[PDB]
Every structure is written in C-alpha cells, then in structure tokens.
Amino acid sequence: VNPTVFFDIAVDGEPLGRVSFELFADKVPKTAENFRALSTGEKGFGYKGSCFHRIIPGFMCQGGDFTRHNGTGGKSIYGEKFEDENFILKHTGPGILSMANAGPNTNGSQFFICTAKTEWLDGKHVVFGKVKEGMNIVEAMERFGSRNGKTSKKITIADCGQLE
C-alpha cells in the first residue's frame, strides 16, 4: 500500500547514486501522495531536474524548490500550499524524509532528508517518508555542504518516478 518513489542524484551533471523513498501512505497519505505526484510529473511539474540548494553536514539535505530553486518557491499539487497533515512520525534518525515548510500550515514542494536524529523538528515538520536504499548516497551529498546550507558542487535530482 506504500508508494515507492526514487531520486537519481547527480553531482555536477555526474550521476552520484540512487536514493529511493517510501511514501508513508498509511500514516501520511495527503503529504506522501504530494511527493508521489511531484515525483512523477503526471501533475505537469515536480522535482525532476531540481537541486538540493541547502545541505548542512550532520543535519540534513534540503531540496524540492523547483520554482525559484532556493527556498522561496515550490508548489504542491493541492494547489500551492497545503496544511500539515499531522505530526505522528518523529525525526527519529538519518534517512527520515520530512517537509520543508515556512511557518505552520505551509507545505508546498520543499522537503529535506535527515542525516542525523532531529527530534526538535518533531511537531513542527510533517514526516512522510524515509530513504530505503542509498542512505549512503545521501551521506554522499552530505560532504558537499556546509554549516550555513550552501553546497560546494551542484546536487541535482537527475530523474524521478515511482517503482512500486
């Protein structure tokens, strides 16, 4: 019942490795479905080609901004911005996929992949998935970041779609 989408990551054009995600349909069906439709482009837009504009080593890797590509864009499929489905799932550790919002009730397309346990974000950010395979490929995108978010090389989602 849990949709499975993936990102083929690239560093400076070069494909780095694949990173698949479970879209927790049962716990977060509104939020995970968004990522699912955004991953396919069957909505007309989505994450394909987008980059990870903000990567902070030991914290997380943030992407999803396919409109302005920096933190100020992105638009969900329920329009432009949907309310946080719930906060049932906590940021329990590396691999956790959660929504990157701009103040409560503002989920769009931005998301972040955790590279450590971020319990402080519990209740503030909607957890909706987790790295299945390639969590080492996300630890690969880790090094090309810094304290402030800014990445060295250009981390991009080469392709994307659903596998199961």
Binding site: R54, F59, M60, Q62, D65, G71, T72, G74, S98, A100, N101, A102, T106, G108, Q110, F112, T118, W120, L121, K124, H125, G149
Partner: peptide
Amino acid sequence: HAGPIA
C-alpha cells in the same frame, strides 16, 4: 523562506 533550523 523555507527550511528547518538547528
């Protein structure tokens, strides 16, 4: 601007 902190 979007993006979690800490």
